[PDB]
């Protein structure tokens, strides 16, 4: 679910950043590891902010991110003890780079079923598709292994009640260990990375 909006693509892949206060040294090291992971695989670069008007801020705040470059000022990545692991930060940086959740692709109904009977009442909005004008997938197919893909029981009424079920053979969903091959391939196209 790569944004179609050109102004949301950070210029030349440069993403200035600030790390806020109130983190431990270990937490800060994880933020740097997550940035370096993106930099290893794609042409995105993270730059210690000096005077840039628009930048990301790793912000001590409750868990619960703008997609792409908002512009007009800083944008926060909310980090707490329940959402500070490497793979979670890599996912949040996927939002920063320009990705919505994989299940919100306009073509998602070709790939997953949303099991409405199992969604926690009042949490249905989390499963809305992006409008087709908001996403340009760059010719890359739906990626079950994306770091941006929800797990099978996200916002479910029960641990064993799936809210998202792949439609064909089932691929595991919801990994938060590293960027997938598809994430990388698609980020490279979005940022027009040299190859
Ligand atoms: Zn997310
Ligand atoms: Zn994708």
Curated annotation (Swiss-Prot):
Residues bearing attached sugar chains per UniProt: 22
Tissue-wise expression: Ubiquitous.
* Residues at the catalytic site: 92
Q: List the disulfide bonds.
A: 43-193, 63-83
Q: Where does Zn(2+) bind?
A: 91, 95, 101
Annotated membrane-spanning segments are none
Instruction: State how it assembles.
Output: Interacts with POSTN, the interaction promotes deposition on the extracellular matrix.
Disease per record: Osteogenesis imperfecta 13: An autosomal recessive form of osteogenesis imperfecta, a disorder of bone formation characterized by low bone mass, bone fragility and susceptibility to fractures after minimal trauma. Disease severity ranges from very mild forms without fractures to intrauterine fractures and perinatal lethality. Extraskeletal manifestations, which affect a variable number of patients, are dentinogenesis imperfecta, hearing loss, and blue sclerae.
Q: Its biological function? A: Metalloprotease that plays key roles in regulating the formation of the extracellular matrix (ECM) via processing of various precursor proteins into mature functional enzymes or structural proteins. Thereby participates in several developmental and physiological processes such as cartilage and bone formation, muscle growth and homeostasis, wound healing and tissue repair.
In Swiss-Prot or TrEMBL terms, this protein is called Bone morphogenetic protein 1
Q: Which organism is it from?
A: Homo sapiens (Human)
State the covered range within the intact protein: 121 to 321 of 986
């Amino acid at each position: 679910a790569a944004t179609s909006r050109p102004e949301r693509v950070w210029p030349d892949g440069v993403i200035p950043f600030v790390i806020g206060g109130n983190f431990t040294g270990s937490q800060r090291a994880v933020f740097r590891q997550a940035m370096r992971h993106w930099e290893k695989h794609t042409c995105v670069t993270f730059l210690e902010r000096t005077d840039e008007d628009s930048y990301i801020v790793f912000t001590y705040r409750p868990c619960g991110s703008y997609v792409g470059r908002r512009g007009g000022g800083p944008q926060a990545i909310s980090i707490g003890k329940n959402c500070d692991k490497f793979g979670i930060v890599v996912h949040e940086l996927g939002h920063v780079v320009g990705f919505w959740h994989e299940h919100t692709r306009p073509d998602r109904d070709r790939h997953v079923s949303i099991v409405r009977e199992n969604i926690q009442p009042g949490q249905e909005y989390n499963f809305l598709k992006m409008e087709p004008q908001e996403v340009e997938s760059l010719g890359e197919t739906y990626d079950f292994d994306s770091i941006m893909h929800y797990a099978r029981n996200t916002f479910s009424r029960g641990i064993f009640l799936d809210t998202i079920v792949p439609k064909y053979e089932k691929p595991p969903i919801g990994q938060r260990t590293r960027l997938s091959k598809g994430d990388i391939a698609q980020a490279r196209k979005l940022y027009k990375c040299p190859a």
